[PDB]
Design an enzyme around this catalytic site. Structure first.
Site, mmCIF file in Angstrom:
data_model
loop_
_atom_site.group_PDB
_atom_site.id
_atom_site.type_symbol
_atom_site.label_atom_id
_atom_site.label_comp_id
_atom_site.label_asym_id
_atom_site.label_seq_id
_atom_site.Cartn_x
_atom_site.Cartn_y
_atom_site.Cartn_z
ATOM 1 N N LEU B 42 39.541 26.014 -2.107
ATOM 2 C CA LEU B 42 39.878 25.071 -3.332
ATOM 3 C C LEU B 42 39.356 25.516 -4.934
ATOM 4 C CD1 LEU B 42 39.430 21.990 -0.867
ATOM 5 C CD2 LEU B 42 41.618 22.983 -1.631
ATOM 6 N N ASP B 43 40.148 25.349 -5.779
ATOM 7 C CA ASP B 43 40.036 25.202 -7.115
ATOM 8 C C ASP B 43 39.596 23.962 -7.879
ATOM 9 O OD1 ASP B 43 42.475 23.532 -7.451
ATOM 10 O OD2 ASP B 43 43.802 24.357 -8.173
ATOM 11 N N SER B 44 39.442 23.602 -8.915
ATOM 12 C CA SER B 44 38.151 22.315 -9.617
ATOM 13 C C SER B 44 39.278 20.801 -9.050
ATOM 14 C CB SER B 44 38.211 22.854 -10.588
#
Ligand SMILES: CCCCCCCCCCCCCCCCCC(=O)OC[C@H](COP(=O)([O-])OCC(O)COP(=O)([O-])OC[C@@H](COC(=O)CCCCCCCCCCCCCCCCC)OC(=O)CCCCCCCCCCCCCCCCC)OC(=O)CCCCCCCCCCCCCCCCC
Ligand SMILES: CCCCCCCCCCCCCCCCCC(=O)OC[C@H](COP(=O)([O-])OCC(O)COP(=O)([O-])OC[C@@H](COC(=O)CCCCCCCCCCCCCCCCC)OC(=O)CCCCCCCCCCCCCCCCC)OC(=O)CCCCCCCCCCCCCCCCC
Ligand SMILES: CCCCCCCCCCCCCCCCC[C@@H](O)O[C@H](CO[C@H](O)CCCCCCCCCCCCCCC)COP(=O)(O)OCC[N+](C)(C)C
Ligand SMILES: CCCCCCCCCCCCCCCCC[C@@H](O)O[C@H](CO[C@H](O)CCCCCCCCCCCCCCC)COP(=O)(O)OCC[N+](C)(C)C
Ligand SMILES: CCCCCCCCCCCC(=O)SCCNC(=O)CCNC(=O)[C@H](O)C(C)(C)COP(=O)(O)O
Lengths: 56, 88, 69, 178, 459, 104
Positions: B42-44
């Site tokens: 997952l990204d930020s």
């Protein structure tokens, strides 16, 4: 044994003695201002059969 | 009386429940020590959404500086337990 | 469970309060009892005209027994 | 509230904070859940549209524009969690918090109740008294010559050490003291 | 009235002959007994005064002031024995001697039948106060505070001496009864104007009038606690007593010479109340409070009506009690934390609840909550001023709002909030401090129960 | 010496509760402190406060309030019955006043 008790707590009579002396001196001061005793137009009164002065 | 004495097991159960209601995370592949960036990919922004989901679940906000740091469900549970004085 | 509640020492304030109550009551319960006894058993004077030839005392011009005393 | 701050925020940190703020204010505007989900997905798409800009100048210009739009379109009465710094229960229980040193002044009759609690307290105090000098010396060693540059503290490393400056963090009153 | 004077003169050798460890006990017990004796002076007449002798007389204006003085002595004794514990026996006896001499001079000042004797005693009150301030103060500013206290007073008081001897050479007497019965109006001439100013300025600087008050914050902050108590509670009321006495011979000149002092009093009341809103020192706030209340008293004395005189008497008594209580409350925190800054120690209600209750009651009486005698005096003065002119209500109205604001500001800053984390030496309140606060506050409400005892001779 | 003078160090303040957990804050000596508390309480609250308040409450009416009320009742009764005015503007009989002869 009361010698030590008295010598430790004799400073407790100075103030009552001063109070009674002040009362006496106030009576003496009142004794010198009787120039109008029983002489005011409002309170002038005939004496009772026994009393000598209306106030002291 | 008031709400029951929240425990660490309940906190972990609720955190895992919320994470398994997330569509971008597979339920079985998720573990209590799973990392959000490395293991789950997952990204930020997804991490921000997860932090907001945790806030909604427990009814209290988490400061951004503190929120940025948590990366696995263990860190989330630990932060919640330390915040609410949970020792058992 | 039952947890410990941290509080400041409430011993000294309570001690002062009970000391003040004790001394105030110690001197004020006898005074209240005496006032009630005086009022019940020695009432107030009744206003009356000065009889002819009588010169009342200065304290005889007030009605309450404690004020007269 | 628990982590030591840094000298400055980074561009991605600012973008994440703006994203959270915008989502919260949009939820304040969109009361219902389905409408909020719709517009939150729209907001996420809008945010990740320009995710791949290699020109940092234009990235900061876009961030500036987005912040201006947020300030124009923010909710004047946004939702706040009850214990957040603007909530209705923010500092409600601060009057019930009593520092632990107040227990040192209890009358011995008060301490006659709760004997075991005060025995544990004595044990904790002895622990602190024994660990203080080791904490101070560890801080002395780990500190750069020109003084500390951040507010981050080192942990314990040795046999039975304790993390320096721990007494007032460990012995917090409580969040619901009384 | 030697039955009160002589026991104090006996307090002197009783203190100097006591054992090293019984001075406080003996002084306190016999001071309380002397106060009980002085309580008999409240039996006053409706037409004339009690004329004990050629030298001393008691009016319905001076009897509550004498009772307040004799009651204030034991409270000062209790408040002083904490911070004087490390002092030697001889210096402790000298401190008690200073306090006793101050009480004796104050007692004789309020009952002197002549104006020159009154002047001599009202000026003799300076030496013990100056010695107390400059010898037992804590900081180096106490020397300057003593100089300010001395010279502000004397520069006003010496022209009063000249005017008094001139008046005696003119009319043949300074006895107050003769002065009252044989009163004659003052014409409108420059000589009479300067005679008015000479007879008024000393009492004005004693109040003190706004613009002439700079000595008061210095003296009342730099003094020890007993010094502050007696400076705020009794020594400021010398000006009001003397002004109500002296105004008998100043008519009809006052009708227009009062204007500058009235404007100064009202506007400087507003100014000192505003100053109380931004004050970092807790004691200076109480001092400026005293200045505002005394400005009200000045207005009441200047407008010269029966209601204004009643209000002035009630306000003087109430302010004495309230300001002494507030000074003691501040001194407790100072003794705990050794600092006067108001925002240092906060959230004290959490640590000291009963002291917080005492703070609340003191600050409620400061803002004149009804039916306290503070409000009785303030309302009588306000009504008299309204009759004088309907526009005074605006200035008076502003003052009421401001006083409430700064009183509750003091309360909220000191008692509410969260306790400072670094201060861990805040010990529980001693029985002595609680007894001090109770002995301050209970007489206030007891006097509220029977307010004609503090309403003066115009009642 | 890099000093300016020989001086004692500033000492720490003593806690009266350390040597006396019930110390009353009057003195370091427990017996003297206890008796100071006792005399303060007895002579302040028991003697001066309560007894003095009772004495002041029961003071005789030397202000002549009730006498004035009764005198006014007599005067109002007498003046109402006779038809005389309740009060007179002049408190001094004009027959005993002599105005100046000429006003011009
Ligand atoms: C706890 C402390 C903590 C700290 C707090 C701070 C404390 C500080 C204290 C400091 C010191 C203060 C001292 C003050 C001194 C002042 C004393 C004084 O002057 O006394 C005055 C006054 C006495 O007046 P007086 O001038 O002496 O008497 C004149 C007459 O000659 C008398 O007329 P009489 O001939 O009818 O005689 C009446 C007599 C007898 O009366 C009766 O017997 C009749 C009563 C009715 C009964 C009828 C039915 C009942 C019986 C029926 C059944 C039995 C019979 C049949 C048997 C069969 C049964 C079926 O009663 C009395 O004598 C009066 C009571 C004595 C009170 C004295 C107060 C002294 C206080 C000093 C101590 C201070 C510390 C406090 C400690 C005290 C103890 C707690 O006492 C009162 O206070 C009276 C108040 C009661 C009136 C009713 C209330 C009216 C309410 C109106 C307001 C409504 C609004 C709501 C507000 C309500 C709030 C109340
Ligand atoms: C009006 C009700 C009438 C009741 C009838 C009987 C009243 C007997 C009271 C005797 C005098 C009170 C003693 C003063 C010292 C306080 C004692 C203390 O240190 O607390 C330890 C004591 C031990 O408990 P604790 O657990 O240790 O709590 C300690 C903590 O600090 C925590 O303590 P806390 O949180 O519980 O707070 C302590 C409390 C106590 O702190 C106080 O502030 C009480 C002092 C009153 C304020 C003083 C300045 C205001 C000027 C008003 C002057 C009125 C005095 C009248 C003459 C009284 C003669 C003594 O403060 C308050 O709770 C709120 C204060 C705000 C009062 C607002 C009322 C304004 C005036 C209302 C009408 C007044 C005239 C009545 C007639 C009107 C026409 C019918 O606390 C209590 O037991 C509670 C105090 C009782 C509250 C009295 C409030 C109403 C009474 C007003 C005057 C009495 C009028 C009597 C005539 C009959 C009507
Ligand atoms: C900082 C706080 C200090 C304390 C405040 C003290 C207050 C002192 C103020 C004195 C009040 C009045 C003083 C004199 C009364 C009238 C003043 C005068 O201006 O009125 C006119 C006076 O006219 C002219 O003004 C003449 C006076 C001009 C010279 C005075 C100098 C004023 C300059 C200001 C100096 C500041 C003084 C205070 C120093 C600090 C009235 O006309 P007139 O009818 O003819 O005189 C009346 C007297 N008669 C009847 C005998 C004739
Ligand atoms: C800690 C817990 C607190 C709460 C619990 C308290 C429980 C209840 C107790 C509270 C009492 C309630 C008060 C209600 C009033 C009742 C008393 C009242 O009736 O008495 C008054 C009387 O009160 C006194 O007159 C006032 C007391 C005098 C105050 C002087 C203080 C003593 C000196 C201390 C030092 C002085 C310092 C200040 C210098 C000026 C009435 O005056 P008066 O109308 O006539 O009486 C008519 C009948 N007479 C004339 C025959 C007597
Ligand atoms: C209710 C009313 C309020 C709503 C108003 C608000 C409107 C704002 C919408 C438009 C603003 C934008 O999208 S402005 C988009 C700015 N673009 C860039 O910064 C490009 C470089 N990318 C990065 O720095 C990081 O990858 C990052 C993208 C931060 C993610 O971080 P992670 O992937 O490492 O978690």
């Amino acid at each position: 044994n009361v010698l030590q008790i008295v010598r430790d707590h004799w400073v407790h009579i100075l103030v009552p003695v001063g109070f009674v002396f002040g009362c006496y001196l106030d009576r003496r001061s009142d004794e010198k201002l009787t120039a109008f005793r029983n002489k005011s137009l409002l309170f002038k009164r005939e004496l009772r059969p026994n009393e000598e002065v209306t106030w002291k | 009386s008031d709400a029951p004495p929240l425990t660490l097991e309940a906190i972990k159960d609720r955190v895992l429940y919320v994470l398994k209601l997330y569509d971008k995370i597979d339920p079985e592949k998720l573990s209590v020590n799973s990392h959000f960036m490395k293991d789950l990919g997952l990204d930020s922004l997804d991490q921000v959404e997860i932090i907001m989901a945790m806030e909604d679940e427990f009814g209290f906000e988490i400061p951004d500086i503190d929120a940025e740091k948590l990366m696995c469900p263990q860190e989330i549970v630990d932060y919640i337990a330390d915040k609410k004085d949970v020792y058992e | 469970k039952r947890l410990f509640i941290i509080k400041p020492s409430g011993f000294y304030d309570r001690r002062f309060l009970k000391l003040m109550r004790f001394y105030i009551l110690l001197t004020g319960i006898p005074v209240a009892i005496g006032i009630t006894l005086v009022n019940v058993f020695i009432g107030e004077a009744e206003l009356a005209d000065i009889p002819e030839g009588y010169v009342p005392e200065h304290w005889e011009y007030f009605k309450h027994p404690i004020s007269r005393w | 509230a628990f982590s030591a701050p840094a000298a400055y925020l980074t561009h991605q940190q600012k973008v994440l904070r703006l994203y959270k703020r915008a989502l919260r204010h949009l939820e304040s505007w969109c009361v219902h859940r389905d409408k909020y989900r719709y517009f939150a997905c729209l907001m996420r798409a809008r945010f990740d549209e320009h995710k791949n800009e290699k020109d940092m100048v234009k990235a900061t210009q876009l961030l500036r524009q987005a912040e201006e739009e947020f300030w124009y379109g923010q909710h004047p009465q946004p939702y706040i969690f009850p214990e957040s710094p603007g909530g209705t229960s923010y500092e409600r229980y601060e009057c019930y918090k009593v520092p632990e040193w107040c227990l040192d002044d209890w009358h011995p009759s008060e301490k006659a109740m709760y004997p075991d609690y005060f025995a544990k307290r004595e044990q904790w105090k002895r622990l602190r008294r024994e660990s203080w000098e080791r904490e101070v010396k560890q801080l002395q060693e780990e500190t750069p010559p020109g003084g500390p540059r951040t507010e981050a503290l080192p942990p314990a490393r040795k046999e039975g050490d304790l993390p320096p400056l721990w007494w007032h963090i460990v012995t917090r009153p409580r969040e619901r003291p009384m | 009235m030697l039955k009160i004077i002589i026991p104090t003169t006996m307090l002197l050798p009783m203190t100097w002959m006591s054992k090293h460890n019984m001075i406080w006990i003996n002084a306190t017990v016999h001071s309380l007994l002397i106060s009980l004796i002085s309580l008999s002076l409240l039996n006053q007449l409706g037409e004339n005064s009690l004329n004990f002798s050629l030298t001393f007389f008691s009016d319905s204006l001076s009897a509550p002031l004498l009772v307040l003085t004799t009651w204030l002595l034991p409270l000062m004794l209790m408040a002083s024995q904490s911070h004087l514990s490390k002092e030697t026996t001889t210096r402790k006896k000298l401190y008690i001697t200073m306090l006793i001499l101050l009480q004796l001079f104050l007692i004789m000042t309020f009952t002197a039948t002549e104006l020159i004797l009154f002047y001599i005693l009202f000026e003799a009150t300076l030496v013990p106060t100056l010695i107390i301030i400059t010898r037992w103060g804590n900081q180096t500013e106490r020397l300057n505070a003593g100089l300010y206290f001395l010279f502000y007073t004397l520069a006003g008081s010496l022209p009063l001496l000249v005017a008094l001897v001139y008046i005696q050479n003119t009319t043949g007497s300074l006895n107050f009864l003769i002065i009252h019965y044989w009163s004659h109006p003052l014409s409108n001439s420059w000589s009479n104007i300067f005679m008015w100013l000479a007879c008024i300025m000393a009492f004005m600087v004693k109040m003190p009038l706004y613009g002439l008050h700079l000595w008061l914050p210095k003296a009342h902050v730099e003094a020890p606690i007993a010094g502050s108590m007696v400076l705020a509670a009794v020594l400021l009321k010398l000006g009001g007593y003397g002004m109500m006495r002296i105004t008998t011979i100043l008519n009809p000149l006052t009708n227009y010479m009062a204007y500058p002092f009235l404007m100064l009093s009202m506007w400087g009341m507003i100014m000192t109340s505003s100053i109380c809103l931004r004050q970092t020192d807790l004691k200076s706030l109480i001092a400026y409070s005293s200045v505002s209340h005394m400005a009200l008293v000045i207005v009441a004395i200047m407008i010269q009506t029966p209601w204004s005189f009643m209000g002035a008497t009630a306000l003087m008594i109430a302010h004495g009690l309230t300001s002494s209580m507030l000074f003691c409350l501040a001194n407790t925190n100072y003794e705990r934390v050794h600092s006067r800054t108001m925002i240092l120690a906060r959230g004290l209600q959490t640590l000291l609840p009963l002291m917080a209750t005492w703070w609340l009651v003191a600050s409620l009486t400061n803002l004149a909550l009804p039916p306290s005698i503070n409000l009785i005096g303030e309302l009588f003065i306000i009504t008299a001023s309204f009759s004088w002119s309907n526009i005074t209500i605006i200035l008076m109205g502003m003052n009421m709002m401001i006083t409430a604001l700064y009183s509750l500001y003091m309360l909220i800053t000191t008692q509410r909030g969260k306790y400072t984390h670094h201060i861990n030496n805040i010990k529980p309140s001693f029985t002595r401090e609680n007894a001090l606060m109770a002995l301050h506050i209970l007489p206030l409400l007891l006097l509220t129960l029977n307010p004609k005892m503090i309403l003066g001779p115009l009642y | 010496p890099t000093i300016r003078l020989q001086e004692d160090p500033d000492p720490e303040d003593e806690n009266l509760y350390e040597k006396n957990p019930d110390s009353h804050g009057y003195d370091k000596d427990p017996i003297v402190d206890l008796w100071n508390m006792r005399v303060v309480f007895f002579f302040g609250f028991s003697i001066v406060l309560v007894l003095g308040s009772t004495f002041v409450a029961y003071l005789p009416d030397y202000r002549m309030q009730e006498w004035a009320r009764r005198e006014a009742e007599r005067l109002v009764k007498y003046r109402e019955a006779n038809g005389l005015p309740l009060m007179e503007s002049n408190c001094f009989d004009p027959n005993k006043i002599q105005l100046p002869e000429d006003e011009d």
